[PDB]
Amino acid sequence: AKAPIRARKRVRKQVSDGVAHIHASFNNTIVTITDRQGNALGWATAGGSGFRGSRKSTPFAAQVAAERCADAVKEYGIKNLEVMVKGPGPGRESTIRALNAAGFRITNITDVTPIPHNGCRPPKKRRV
Amino acid sequence: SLSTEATAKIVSEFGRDANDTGSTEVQVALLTAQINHLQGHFAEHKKDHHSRRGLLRMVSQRRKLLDYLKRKDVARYTRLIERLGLRR
Amino acid sequence: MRHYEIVFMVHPDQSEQVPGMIERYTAAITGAEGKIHRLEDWGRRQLAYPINKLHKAHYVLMNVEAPQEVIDELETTFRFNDAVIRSMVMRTKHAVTEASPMVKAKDERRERRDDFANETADDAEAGDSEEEEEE
Amino acid sequence: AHIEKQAGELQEKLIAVNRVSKTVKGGRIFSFTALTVVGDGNGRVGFGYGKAREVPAAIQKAMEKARRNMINVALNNGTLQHPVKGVHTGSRVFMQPASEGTGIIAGGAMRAVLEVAGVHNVLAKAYGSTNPINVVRATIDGLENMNSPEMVAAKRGKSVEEILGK
Amino acid sequence: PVIKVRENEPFDVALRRFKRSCEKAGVLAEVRRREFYEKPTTERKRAKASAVKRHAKKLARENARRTRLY
Amino acid sequence: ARYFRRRKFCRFTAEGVQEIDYKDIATLKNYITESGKIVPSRITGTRAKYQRQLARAIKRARYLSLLPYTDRHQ
Amino acid sequence: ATVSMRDMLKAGVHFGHQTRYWNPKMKPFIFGARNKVHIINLEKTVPMFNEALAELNKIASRKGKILFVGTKRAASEAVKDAALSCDQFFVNHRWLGGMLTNWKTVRQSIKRLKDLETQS
RNA sequence: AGGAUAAGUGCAUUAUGUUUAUGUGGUGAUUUGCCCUUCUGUAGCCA
RNA sequence: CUUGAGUCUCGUAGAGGGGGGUAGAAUUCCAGGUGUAGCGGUGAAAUGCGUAGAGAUCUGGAGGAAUACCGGUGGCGAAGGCGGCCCCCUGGACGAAGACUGACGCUCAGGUGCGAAAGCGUGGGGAGCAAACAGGAUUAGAUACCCUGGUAGUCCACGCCGUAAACGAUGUCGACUUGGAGGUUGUGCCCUUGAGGCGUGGCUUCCGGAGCUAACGCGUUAAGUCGACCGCCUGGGGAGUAC
């Protein structure tokens, strides 16, 4: 479910507020909570929560990553939150469910997906 | 493509000076005039093949209408081919 | 004879260049067998993305007619111009250099989406109070 | 279903009979096949290949497939006089315009098929599939009109309605 | 994907089942494979094509009742 | 009574509204969802005319900074 | 016998309900759509219908019995109204296509029905 | 995005997913036709 | 002569070609700031990368192919061919009025001309992906499968025999033969006022009647009725190679 993190209760930069970022891929989600003017206040992942395989991208693996970072960032003491989502990777709602159980008010799901303007040709990999 | 003002020189000078465009002497003169616009383009790079297909239509037909013209009236034929420097 | 509904926008610090450039385009058009249908300056506007930084730019819709020869001379100038950040210019096939359903949306741009400056005195000179000056 | 010429009383000219199989557990084939050409002993259209659970049904299938459930091009009287080529379902029979009645020669069982078919009067070579299960089509592809009667005034037959229509 | 505006002041969901602009709608039909220039037009762009089967499905339900094959 | 042929403001609802143009944000925006972006033809219910031209006009516009092209502006 | 022409107009004035698509092989008797609904030419069907209704009259002295076929889940009530007798026979809802050549079976199931209908 | 008025509403790994080892060749019970109904199953009309 | 064909301005659509212009986003990268251990890969995985502070993330710059979406049974080209969008040059099509010539026609050995792709001569470019080569993983083995690094390549410009699955797997063009409708476009008539109906063309496509096919299927853009002229075939293996 979890691995080592910052505290729930002490003091560090004492910022009162942040923005959160969910980087969702086909295999992992990276959830990194940041300062509202642009400096990281903590991170987790679904693989650093103890999931592997296809299972690393399921909504319940996206959840436990999000609840892992969301704990840690109370040492910097957030009280209100806004969120960015950036990817087509699964469980884009389950990570929000965890941030609201950490006590946060969720203030817009601002889509800034990392899709290019087509970009580069993709890997050969498989035959269909 | 052929301007109205290039068409107006050509109409006034060759065939009848009131809107004759279809007579064989003047029809040659029009095709020639669009060749000249196309030879201005082909001073750029020389992969201009999708227009060259179209040049070959205009040339061949011009040449068909000169074969028709030498079977008819000989003055129109020797004037036309010599005054526009055609068949090259 | 051909119609080109040319619309463009210009960077704020450079907007001083446009009142002069348009008046050199109008005298080359009316001097040789085309028309200025309307020439509308739109004022300073909010972009939908900052270009070359800064989230505002100043828009002019020229509403040009010119022959094939003339339009060839204005367009090589306009394409290598430096004041324009970007432009889009349309074809003779169903062209609309006269009367549009953007009549409301122009008035709005000058009225509500502008930023009032010295460059923007120049914005009113850009298509209504024309003086010959720059390129 | 499919309509044919006149006859009175019929001859079941069975020219060939065979047996099929693909026997296995549950759904299977184990039936018989039979081939018959139906006619009146001078000239009629009708050709049927059919199959069933045993020899009695096999033949009754085949006699039904001649008389119905089959596309044919028609004949009139037990004699031919519109000798022309043709194709029906790949099978090609060619007949060049020549004498009626006499000259009849065709190998194997085919001289007997031609007597019930009505085209033993004018006939020429076959091409396409050369098997006796499919080349019996003589009175079909080899006759591209719906009547070919024995009076030579046949070519004035449609004429007499056309010039009265004038 | 979630798309930039869909719900009135978020709750514990994100409501991604609901709205979309045009985020990949002609360019992706097969994963783990290379891209092409002319192939996408018939290989990948089946959006109209899959609407023929949605139309047939609302059609075939009535016709099964009239035939009484329901 | 009256008729008009091959011109603006009659047939369909109007032929002077999304003829071909791109310089107006509003004609494009009748056909744009709240995320600032183009949606399918079923969604928009544009006349056939208005769509074969709207395919060029939404790109023209995006490119002239009338619409927000990209996802950092959506 | 103007009487056939009254009924054709009296029926025909529903002006269709189906889209402006029609069977190509019917094209002669079809008038142009009004706002995407098919409309038959009403006048062009009135000469056909009078020829048909006299031919039906001539067979009345030949007649054995009539069989109304083409019945289905929407056409049955319209056949119910047509027959007004048991000199003319019909079904209500559906019809099994073909009876004419496998009559052998069909008469054998009629005998099974009436035996077991009398026991019931 | 003019406007986020969460408006202009119509979908979520952007649905087209699938390493999962292989094993020579041909043959074989619904029958010798030493073949049950053709019977209105053809414009006449029949078993 | 027009009944065949050819031509001028007007009106209309499009990714045809060649050269110009132009915006923004991921990967990739550098910098500064913040911040802590996995990231990645997959059916599970190791190889790879990372504590020299990776991954993610804020701000700003970089750099080069590509250009999503509207996008579709769509549209353009001579078949293959062509995809952001526009201009400049210019080809080709599609409508319609005024006006013009009057078989100037059809087909096409010979023929010159012309590339999907890679290959390729020399030049620019290489962010991502990737043959090989390395090493994992797969398994009766693993060159195939599936993965990671990674170089040439992919990407442009002109050039060389235009190669092929060079397409409707269907020669050309043209006359003739029941249509209906979608997509989508000139235009005559209607309250243009319903992407609408009717008059008449247009490409592109579904459906199906006479007819055509062995079967699927084709059917007004034929695979029907034909017409002229050309290209080409005559069982397989061996061989599309040899000479």
Curated annotation (Swiss-Prot), chain A:
PANTHER family assigned to the protein according to its UniProt record, in alphabetical order: 40S RIBOSOMAL PROTEIN S14/30S RIBOSOMAL PROTEIN S11
Residues recorded as bearing N-methylalanine in the entry: 1
Stated family: Belongs to the universal ribosomal protein uS11 family.
Example GO biological process: translation
Signal sequence residues: none
InterPro entries: Ribosomal_uS11, Ribosomal_uS11_bac-type, Ribosomal_uS11_CS, Ribosomal_uS11_sf
Listed GO MF terms: small ribosomal subunit rRNA binding; structural constituent of ribosome
Protein name: Small ribosomal subunit protein uS11
Complex formation: Part of the 30S ribosomal subunit. Interacts with proteins uS7 and bS18. Cross-links to IF-3. In stalled ribosomes contacts ribosome rescue factor SmrB.
Keywords on record: Methylation, Ribonucleoprotein, Ribosomal protein, RNA-binding, rRNA-binding
GO cellular component entries: cytoplasm; cytosol; cytosolic small ribosomal subunit
Gene name of this polypeptide: rpsK
Other remarks in the entry: Has been predicted to contact the N-terminal domain of IF-3 based on footprint studies; exactly how IF-3 interacts with the 30S subunit is controversial.
Function recorded in the entry: Located on the platform of the 30S subunit, it bridges several disparate RNA helices of the 16S rRNA. Forms part of the Shine-Dalgarno cleft in the 70S ribosome.
UniProtKB/Swiss-Prot annotation, chain D:
Presence of keyword Aminoacyl-tRNA synthetase: no
Stored Gene3D superfamilies: 3.30.160.20, 3.30.230.10
UniProt keyword tRNA processing present: no
Domain of life: Bacteria
UniProt GO BP: cytoplasmic translation; maintenance of translational fidelity; response to antibiotic; ribosomal small subunit assembly; translation
Consequence of substituting residue 21 to P: In strain: SPCR13 and SPCR15; spectinomycin resistant. Not a ram mutation
A Pfam family it matches: Ribosomal_S5
GO CC terms of this entry: cytoplasm; cytosol; cytosolic small ribosomal subunit
Keywords assigned by UniProt, alphabetized: Acetylation, Antibiotic resistance, Ribonucleoprotein, Ribosomal protein, RNA-binding, rRNA-binding
S5 DRBM domain location: 10-73
PROSITE patterns referenced in this protein's UniProt entry, alphabetically: RIBOSOMAL_S5 (PS00585), S5_DSRBD (PS50881)
Location of N-acetylalanine modifications: 1
One GO MF term: structural constituent of ribosome
Note: Altered uS5 proteins have been identified in a number of mutants. Some mutations in uS5 have been shown to increase translational error frequencies.
Quaternary structure note: Part of the 30S ribosomal subunit. Contacts proteins uS4 and uS8. With proteins uS4 and uS5 encircles the mRNA as it enters the ribosome, which may play a role in mRNA helicase processivity. Can be cross-linked to mRNA. In collided ribosomes contacts ribosome rescue factor SmrB.
Matching HAMAP family: Ribosomal_uS5_B
UniProt free text on domains: The N-terminal domain interacts with the head of the 30S subunit; the C-terminal domain interacts with the body and contacts protein uS4. The interaction surface between uS4 and uS5 is involved in control of translational fidelity.
Similarity comment text for this entry: Belongs to the universal ribosomal protein uS5 family.
Name by which UniProt lists this protein: Small ribosomal subunit protein uS5
Swiss-Prot record, chain F:
Keywords: Acetylation, Ribonucleoprotein, Ribosomal protein, RNA-binding, rRNA-binding
GO terms of biological process kind: cytoplasmic translation; translation
Highest taxon listed in the record's lineage: Bacteria
One of the record's GO molecular function terms: structural constituent of ribosome
Modified residues (N-acetylalanine): 1
GO cellular component: cytoplasm; cytosol; cytosolic small ribosomal subunit
Pfam family, one: Ribosomal_S18
Functional description taken from the UniProt entry: Binds as a heterodimer with protein bS6 to the central domain of the 16S rRNA, where it helps stabilize the platform of the 30S subunit.
UniProt record similarity statement: Belongs to the bacterial ribosomal protein bS18 family.
Record text on subunit structure and interactions: Part of the 30S ribosomal subunit. Forms a tight heterodimer with protein bS6.
Protein name as annotated: Small ribosomal subunit protein bS18
Species, as recorded: Escherichia coli (strain K12)
Curated annotation (Swiss-Prot), chain G:
Protein function: Required for ribosomal protein bS1 (rpsA) to bind to the 30S subunit.
Residues of the whole record sequence present: 2 to 121 of 241
Residue(s) carrying N6-succinyllysine: 114
Origin: domain of life: Bacteria
Organism listed in the record: Escherichia coli (strain K12)
Protein name, as recorded: Small ribosomal subunit protein uS2
Family affiliation: Belongs to the universal ribosomal protein uS2 family.
Lineage, broadest ranks: Bacteria, Pseudomonadati, Pseudomonadota, Gammaproteobacteria, Enterobacterales
Assembly description: Part of the 30S ribosomal subunit, contacts bS1. Some nascent polypeptide chains are able to cross-link to this protein in situ. In collided ribosomes contacts ribosome rescue factor SmrB.
